[PDB]
Amino acid sequence: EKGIYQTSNFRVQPTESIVRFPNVTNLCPFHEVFNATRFASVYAWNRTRISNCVADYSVLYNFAPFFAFKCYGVSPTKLNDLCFTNVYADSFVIKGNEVSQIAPGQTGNIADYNYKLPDDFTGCVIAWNSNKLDSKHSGNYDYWYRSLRKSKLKPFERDISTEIYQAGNKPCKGKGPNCYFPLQSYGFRPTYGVGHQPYRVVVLSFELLHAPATVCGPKKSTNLVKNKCVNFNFNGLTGTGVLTKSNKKFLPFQQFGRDIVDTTDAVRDPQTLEILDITPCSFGGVSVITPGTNTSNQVA
Amino acid sequence: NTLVKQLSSKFGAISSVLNDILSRLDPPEAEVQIDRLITGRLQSLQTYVT
């Protein structure tokens, strides 16, 4: 019928993509942690901090085929596209029967006594069979497990101190019937079955807090193009818009800006420290003005 | 202003920004987080229109 009708909306599409990361050439020490000649016990788990490096995770696939690679807050495939605040590698040797227990929210002896992941957990739990390195006929001295813990552990708590657990109703000083001895180190023989066999587990703890720091994957940057509708990735911040020179007076401290409604409206360029405003690309509704089909097929 | 402010809410999702959900997660997980956001935004629009 004759009239004006609203149908589709219009948007101006981007013409190119801008990828900007700080010019960091140092590679992250993932092989030193995974390929170490000696690893800490599950009780005394080794927390290695990875920072100021390129988080190229292809090296883990080069290291070994894996029995487990369970990412909880991220997809394994996309780790190379992200930036992280403070990657932590928790490295230890555990019994195979407890490997499936290293997960957020689990209950059991290992979760409660040596190593706990927070219920709200972003990261990856990587595990593989390690019999080829640490299995000995005489038995190694690397295993060290808490037999019984006085109280449950909090996430990422490591109770290094060793104390006698009181099993009886009175204080006990080394007397068998009342003292429970708090450690269960054991040497391992190559002949034990899979549930007993050691697995080497590395937990990568990630905090994706809008990349205040770097630890970014192996992405190649491009040139910075202004005054055009473009897609962009600024140190992990992904979006679409028009980048312009900013007149905002940022303190050396602030890195990103937001509007009164908390949307992003400015970024700091990771390589030049230039402040850029983000203007959304043109969009609006489209109306069609029709004289009516039985009059004319011309429209505006 | 209220209708715009509702976009920053998570509604139980890991993030209020769809680009971050799609950037970090595989489709089978992203669909769950996205559906949580769709429900929240759709309820916000129905409240606004009413």
Binding site: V261, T263, P280, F283 | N1, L3, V4, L7
Partner: peptide, 29 residues
């Protein structure tokens, strides 16, 4: 003598109460 050709009272009424989507660019126009 004034643009918009409003009366003195209308001009006062328009000055007392306070096209491009610079704000709220989230599909709201």
């Amino acid at each position: 003598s004034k643009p918009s050709k409003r009366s003195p009272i209308e001009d006062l009424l328009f000055n007392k109460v306070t096209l491009i989507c610079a704000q709220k660019f989230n599909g709201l126009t």
